[PDB]
Design a protein around this ligand. Structure first.
Ligand SMILES: *[C@@H]1O[C@H](CO)[C@@H](O[C@@H]2O[C@H](CO)[C@@H](O)[C@H](O)[C@H]2NC(C)=O)[C@H](O)[C@H]1NC(C)=O
Ligand SMILES: *[C@@H]1O[C@H](CO)[C@@H](O[C@@H]2O[C@H](CO)[C@@H](O)[C@H](O)[C@H]2NC(C)=O)[C@H](O)[C@H]1NC(C)=O
Ligand SMILES: *[C@@H]1O[C@H](CO)[C@@H](O[C@@H]2O[C@H](CO)[C@@H](O)[C@H](O)[C@H]2NC(C)=O)[C@H](O)[C@H]1NC(C)=O
Ligand SMILES: *[C@@H]1O[C@H](CO)[C@@H](O[C@@H]2O[C@H](CO)[C@@H](O)[C@H](O)[C@H]2NC(C)=O)[C@H](O)[C@H]1NC(C)=O
Ligand SMILES: *[C@@H]1O[C@H](CO)[C@@H](O[C@@H]2O[C@H](CO)[C@@H](O)[C@H](O)[C@H]2NC(C)=O)[C@H](O)[C@H]1NC(C)=O
Ligand SMILES: *[C@@H]1O[C@H](CO)[C@@H](O[C@@H]2O[C@H](CO)[C@@H](O)[C@H](O)[C@H]2NC(C)=O)[C@H](O)[C@H]1NC(C)=O
Ligand SMILES: *[C@@H]1O[C@H](CO)[C@@H](O[C@@H]2O[C@H](CO)[C@@H](O)[C@H](O)[C@H]2NC(C)=O)[C@H](O)[C@H]1NC(C)=O
Ligand SMILES: *[C@@H]1O[C@H](CO)[C@@H](O[C@@H]2O[C@H](CO)[C@@H](O)[C@H](O)[C@H]2NC(C)=O)[C@H](O)[C@H]1NC(C)=O
Ligand SMILES: *[C@@H]1O[C@H](CO)[C@@H](O[C@@H]2O[C@H](CO)[C@@H](O)[C@H](O)[C@H]2NC(C)=O)[C@H](O)[C@H]1NC(C)=O
Ligand SMILES: *[C@@H]1O[C@H](CO)[C@@H](O)[C@H](O)[C@H]1NC(C)=O
Ligand SMILES: *[C@@H]1O[C@H](CO)[C@@H](O)[C@H](O)[C@H]1NC(C)=O
Ligand SMILES: *[C@@H]1O[C@H](CO)[C@@H](O)[C@H](O)[C@H]1NC(C)=O
Ligand SMILES: *[C@@H]1O[C@H](CO)[C@@H](O)[C@H](O)[C@H]1NC(C)=O
Lengths: 195, 171, 344, 98, 47
């Protein structure tokens, strides 16, 4: 409500400009004596007015041809855009996407569609982490000559004690045998720590 | 010898056979000629050359302009010389003052150079890619978020254009 | 010369039974290349200089076809700004220029051949330098002065032949050093932050632990990484060495075809100035001398029509090619966001 | 130039391509060969006895100056048609095999 | 087996129609006296 939809206004502008260019191109002689059929057909008799009318016909036909060709090219581009919009409708609105930056910046939560003149607008609701904090970390924990790895988290340390948290939100918990799993002994992992 | 034209005549190194008078290039234009009185060969080179662009801040704000001659190297084939001559890998820019700062691109000149209507006058600068940043990487340090934000963003997509039809006979 | 029926591939059979399974016991770390075109050359055309030259009679006769030249130049400028937009979508994804620290402790992985070389004038990587020398452009710079091809150097240098007929090539907005800076920032972010710098603030994490996260993402437990870390680092380093090797050895055909096509199109435009199009000659100066205005106008009209349609054909094919390059650049931007800024 | 190629009196912020840099010619030069004599206008058009048409004569015109104005007071023609060239550019060209 | 592949038949139809349109466009005068080269080359002399 403040202040734009430039990509949707450019389509309207381009189509209008193409039609108006067609209209002004009716002022070209194309090598004839005039650009009006009524100045040729009056002051000239059929067999020798036909040459001028032929020049005009050829010119105007090629004008129409140029218009149609550029319209076909533009329609191909709009077709690609509409296919992308249909994919975004099925994958961001009718589901939740794991594709990075496909449905906004951040981790995609949901999306809502709104209709616009000759187009669509998507409101992408995403989750953005904030207020990060530094911690010391370790790949594994060594307890009884055994190496323990976190199940769905990461080992952090507030400076003196060790916890296991989830990767995307700081929520520290005590390391137990339900948070971790055991594999091997304490001789192979590189930065293993004792706890 | 009756063949008319326009251009610059220079001494040549081509050497014609005795039955030849004119020389033609691949586009079939006459580019060499034998002088009919001194019997010396001359090359004919065209006279116009080099692209030109005009940079305006909009005539609804000012009629100051800058001009970019995309084929000149000043350290001339220019319309005017004024002041503030600034050389670029895109050509010689005349009418804009070179500054040492860097901003986001306003009017793209090219080869990394942009221009803008600042302080009024026209300035030309090197565009900046973005703010510099460094990550505190170590082999045992991690950063974990403690809060979040819910963000809502818009994305606009064109879906259709106008459907038109034409009557040939009427047009 | 021999003629044969092509083979589809080697025959194979799977030992399928209702209670038999095959489980892998080792792995390999593979590194592969994928090449994608992102831009093409931006060109511009001066109608008057191409169709008429310095002929004033021709230029006055051409004033019945000015709409067509404004139209041609409109199309060409659309293409020209689209090229810069393409490069921006692909390379300018992130707007923070991350640097990699002097702490080159990445768990044993060696990123020295893909990280910037401060010993160059540019800050390109060894790999980027090897790539830069396998694509031969046609314009080493964009300032070719008038005095530099004055004489018979014209029409023997193809670029001056193009320039004397009104065909200009404009330089891209982002220099090669800026694009190298962008890729350097992407690499630094991805090796010091994983996939977090693509979703918000960059959050550091030891390389080894990021690789364990990525092993989790494909269905392999982390201890498989942590217990085989040296083997994995060695396999990665060997695969990167294999790439450089292969390259510096012997190609980038998909990137050279773009340059070749644009150059061939411009040169075809230049040679099509030798067509009569049904006139008595293809030179305006042979018509304007030996013929007087009203009966030279017919010949000049034939030439004007022919050369206009030549320009039109060029612009149309350029539009079609630009659509294809646009599709390729969109694919490259998607691959940048989904393979580099995340895990697919 | 841009206002006029835009067909508008207002120009919006930006950069626009204009025509290539033109240079105008300063002088005009003519270079013809060193020819002094005048062409045999009086032994071709003023001959005493011509030839019959089945054995027609063919004379070779070599290095001479073509001044056909000297005929303006000596003979009228009543048929004179040129084919590859306009009559207003006859005294501005050089001719090869005459 | 009952009752289609319209999207695959449209390609064939379009290509065939384009070629046939090319063939019928050989009946246009384009502003000449006839559309046959043999009616022009006979009853008219080269220039
Ligand atoms: C790391 O976190 C632990 C929390 O478990 C802190 O230790 C406790 O701190 C509270 C309040 O200071 C005390 O009441 C407890 O007795 C402490 N020990 C335990 C076992 O709970 C510890 O101070 C934190 N370290 C740092 C550097 O912040
Ligand atoms: C982690 O704990 C283990 C066991 O408590 C420590 O082990 C010692 O390792 C050295 C070198 O291999 C041996 O000479 C000792 O006999 C071991 N002692 C015991 C009790 O096992 C290990 O050093 C600890 N790690 C750190 C960094 O303190
Ligand atoms: C303008 O001309 C200059 C020199 O005539 C070009 O640059 C020289 O470039 C070399 C490196 O290739 C330097 O070592 C010299 O010191 C430069 N000399 C000068 C006077 O610049 C320059 O490239 C030309 N303009 C552009 C942008 O191409
Ligand atoms: C994480 O710890 C690092 C280490 O001190 C902090 O980063 C440095 O910050 C200073 C001041 O901003 C810079 O001059 C250094 O260049 C930074 N990097 C180093 C020293 O490697 C950082 O602020 C901490 N992060 C958080 C979120 O607290
Ligand atoms: C997480 O961030 C939110 C802000 O997005 C914090 O809530 C704000 O707290 C300040 C100070 O108490 C208030 O002035 C604002 O009104 C709050 N914002 C909203 C939207 O309610 C919140 O405290 C933060 N949480 C933590 C643990 O730091
Ligand atoms: C899995 O067991 C099958 C069963 O023997 C092995 O496959 C056969 O191998 C022989 C010799 O290569 C072939 O002639 C047969 O056609 C195969 N298929 C059958 C018998 O169904 C296979 O080699 C074993 N795979 C591994 C990895 O050991
Ligand atoms: C898994 O495969 C690797 C090879 O990729 C094996 O390591 C190789 O072992 C041979 C023989 O010991 C050595 O000659 C090579 O130098 C090793 N390669 C590398 C890159 O170090 C490894 O032994 C295999 N593991 C198992 C359990 O079979
Ligand atoms: C990463 O690999 C490169 C190989 O590409 C190593 O660099 C070579 O290092 C040696 C020792 O100084 C030099 O003699 C060579 O000239 C270097 N360049 C080559 C071989 O192309 C580099 O040392 C490796 N990094 C680490 C940390 O080992
Ligand atoms: C055409 O006439 C000019 C003079 O009108 C001749 O030019 C002379 O050339 C000789 C060279 O042998 C010089 O020594 C004279 O000084 C020239 N004269 C002048 C006035 O410049 C020229 O030689 C004549 N053409 C031919 C083929 O002889
Ligand atoms: C990390 O680097 C330090 C050097 O400061 C070294 O002492 C330590 O062994 C390294 N640990 C790991 C797990 O790489
Ligand atoms: C430019 O001029 C027009 C008419 O004078 C005016 O309506 C318009 O607002 C002006 N532009 C701006 C940015 O004010
Ligand atoms: C601008 O940068 C140049 C680079 O050498 C420097 O000499 C100058 O002091 C800076 N300030 C100016 C000239 O505005
Ligand atoms: C030829 O010239 C003489 C004058 O020398 C003139 O008397 C005679 O009428 C002329 N005849 C013709 C056919 O020109």
């Amino acid at each position: 409500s403040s202040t734009a939809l430039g990509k949707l206004q450019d389509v309207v502008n381009q189509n209008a400009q193409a039609l108006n260019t067609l209209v002004k191109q009716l002022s070209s002689n194309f090598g004839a004596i005039s650009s009006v059929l009524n100045d040729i057909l009056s002051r000239l008799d059929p067999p020798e007015a036909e040459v001028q009318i032929d020049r005009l016909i050829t010119g105007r036909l090629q004008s129409l041809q140029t218009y149609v060709t550029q319209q076909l090219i533009r329609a191909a581009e709009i077709r690609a855009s509409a296919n992308l919009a249909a994919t975004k409708m099925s994958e961001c609105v009718l589901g939740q996407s794991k594709r990075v930056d496909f449905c906004g910046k951040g981790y995609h939560l949901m999306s809502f569609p709104q209709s616009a003149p000759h187009g669509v607008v998507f409101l992408h609701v995403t989750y953005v982490p904030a207020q990060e904090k530094n911690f010391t970390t370790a790949p594994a924990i060594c307890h009884d000559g055994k190496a323990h790895f976190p199940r769905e988290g990461v080992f952090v340390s507030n400076g003196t004690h060790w916890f296991v948290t989830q990767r995307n939100f700081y929520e520290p918990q005590i390391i137990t045998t339900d948070n971790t799993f055991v594999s091997g002994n304490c001789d192979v992992v590189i930065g293993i720590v004792n706890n | 010898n009756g063949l008319t034209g326009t251009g610059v005549l220079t001494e040549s190194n081509k050497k014609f056979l005795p039955f030849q008078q004119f020389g033609r290039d691949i586009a079939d234009t006459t580019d060499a000629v034998r002088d009919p009185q001194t019997l010396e060969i001359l090359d004919i080179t065209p006279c116009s050359f080099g692209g030109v662009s005009v940079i305006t801040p909009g005539t609804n704000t000012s009629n100051q302009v800058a001009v970019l001659y995309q084929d000149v190297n000043c350290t001339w084939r220019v319309y005017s010389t004024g002041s503030n001559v600034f050389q670029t890998r895109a050509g010689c820019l005349i009418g804009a003052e070179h500054v040492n700062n860097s901003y986001e691109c306003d009017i793209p000149i090219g080869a990394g150079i942009c221009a803008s209507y600042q302080t009024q006058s026209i300035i030309a600068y090197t565009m900046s890619l973005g703010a510099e940043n460094s990550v505190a990487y170590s082999n045992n340090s991690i950063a974990i978020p403690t809060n979040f934000t819910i963000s809502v963003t818009t994305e606009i997509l064109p879906v259709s254009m106008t459907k038109t039809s034409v009557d040939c006979t009427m047009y | 010369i021999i003629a044969y029926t092509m083979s589809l591939g080697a025959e194979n059979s799977v030992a399928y039974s209702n209670n038999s399974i095959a489980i892998p016991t080792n792995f390999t770390i593979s590194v592969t290349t994928e090449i994608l075109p992102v831009s093409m050359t931006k060109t511009s055309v001066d109608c008057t200089m191409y169709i008429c030259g310095d002929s004033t009679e021709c230029s006055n006769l051409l004033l019945q076809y000015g709409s067509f030249c404004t139209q041609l130049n409109r199309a060409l400028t659309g293409i020209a700004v689209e090229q810069d937009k393409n490069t921006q979508e692909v390379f300018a994804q992130v707007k923070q220029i991350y640097k990699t620290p002097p702490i080159k402790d990445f768990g044993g992985f060696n990123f020295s051949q893909i990280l910037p070389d401060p010993s160059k004038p540019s800050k390109r990587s060894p790999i980027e330098d090897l790539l830069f020398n396998k694509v031969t452009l046609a314009d080493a710079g964009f300032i070719k002065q008038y005095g530099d091809c004055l004489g018979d150097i014209a029409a023997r240098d193809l670029i001056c032949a193009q320039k004397f007929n009104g065909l200009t090539v404009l330089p891209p907005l982002l220099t090669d050093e800026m694009i190298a800076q962008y890729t350097s920032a992407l690499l630094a972010g991805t090796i010091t932050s994983g996939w977090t710098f693509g979703a918000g603030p960059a959050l550091q994490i030891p390389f080894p632990m990021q690789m364990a996260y990525r092993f989790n993402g494909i269905g392999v437990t982390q201890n498989v990484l942590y217990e085989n870390q040296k083997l994995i680092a060695n396999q990665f380093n060997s695969a990167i060495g294999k790439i450089q090797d292969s390259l510096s050895s012997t190609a980038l055909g998909k990137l050279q075809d773009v340059v070749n096509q644009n150059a061939q199109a411009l040169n075809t435009l230049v040679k099509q100035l030798s067509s009569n199009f049904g006139a008595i000659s293809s030179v305006l100066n042979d018509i304007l001398s030996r013929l007087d205005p009203p009966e030279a106008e017919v010949q000049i009209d034939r030439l004007i029509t022919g050369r206009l349609q030549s320009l039109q054909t060029y612009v149309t094919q350029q539009l079609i090619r630009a659509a294809e390059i646009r599709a390729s650049a969109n694919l490259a931007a998607t691959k940048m966001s989904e393979c580099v800024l995340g895990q697919s | 130039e841009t206002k006029c190629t835009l067909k508008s009196f207002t120009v919006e912020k930006g950069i626009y391509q204009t025509s290539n840099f033109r240079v105008q010619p300063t002088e005009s030069i003519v270079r013809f060969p060193n020819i002094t004599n005048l062409c045999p206008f009086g032994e071709v058009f003023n001959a005493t006895r011509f030839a019959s048409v089945y054995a027609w004569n063919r004379k070779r015109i070599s290095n001479c100056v073509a001044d056909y104005s000297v005929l303006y007071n000596s003979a009228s023609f009543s048929t004179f048609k040129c084919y590859g060239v306009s009559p207003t550019k006859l005294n501005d060209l050089c001719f090869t095999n005459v």
